[PDB]
Structure 1
Amino acid sequence: DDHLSREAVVDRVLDVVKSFPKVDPSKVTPEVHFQNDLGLDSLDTVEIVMAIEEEFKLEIPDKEADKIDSCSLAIEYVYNHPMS
């Protein structure tokens, strides 16, 4: 009944992004850019955002779902949301 701390969110989000086949889990900092630090396809960013969505059981409205292009933004969005 208590919202999890930020570092607890960091653990789960970094685990989600680490558990991806195309990425290289050698260096995955919380401050990374999907299309600039990991070098991925444009589409697989959508898959990672989705997998984050069901992993925390929250529905991101489609408008700013694609705005999440960095691990930093994803953590902030899944933290400032109260119902998560």
Structure 2
Amino acid sequence: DAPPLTLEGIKDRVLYVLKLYDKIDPEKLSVNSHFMKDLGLDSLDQVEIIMAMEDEFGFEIPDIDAEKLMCPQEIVDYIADKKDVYE
């Protein structure tokens, strides 16, 4: 039960979610692709992506942090903060 999360695992799962998203092409998506400026998404799309992260990992990101996560690396770093990875 309760498997350990790794930055490889969190990275691969966040990118696995974003590669199943029909406004992000899977060939331009990188680990530092900014949502508004580099992938060209809306703040509505950004809220849908953070809600997809909540659907993915089974917890909630609050809105004061959901309004600032603007790359997949910030998502991986935030889940690393809230899950204590690489003990």
Which bin holds the TM-score, normalised by the shorter protein? 0.7 to 0.9
Identity %: 45
Which SS does the other structure have where 1:4 is aligned? coil
Corresponding residue of 2:68: 67
Whole-angstrom distance in 2 between the partners of 1:82 and 1:22: 29
Gap runs ≥5 in structure 1: none
With a CA cutoff of 8 Å and minimum separation of 6, indicate the structure with the bigger relative contact order.
2
Residues in 2 aligned to 1:56 and 1:27: alpha-carbon distance in whole angstroms = 24
C-alpha deviation, 1:43, in angstroms: 1.0
How many residue pairs get aligned? The number is 84
Identify the range of structure 1 (1-10 vs 50-59) with the bigger mean alpha-carbon deviation: 1-10
Residue 79 of structure 1 is matched in structure 2 by 80
Runs of 5+ consecutive residues of structure 2 not aligned to the other structure: none
Distance 2:35 2:63 in 1: 19
CA positional deviation for 1:42: 2.2
Which residue of the partner structure matches residue 9 of structure 1? 10
Q: Which residue of 2 is the match for residue 25 of structure 1?
A: 26
SS class of match (2:69): coil
Matched letter for residue 27 of structure 1:
K
Give deviations 1:12-59, integer Å, cap 9, x for gaps.
000111111111111211111001111112211100110011200111
Distance 2:29 2:60 in 1: 25
Q: CA RMSD in A?
A: 1.8
| TM-score with structure 1 setting the length | 0.88
1:2, CA displacement in angstroms? 4.8
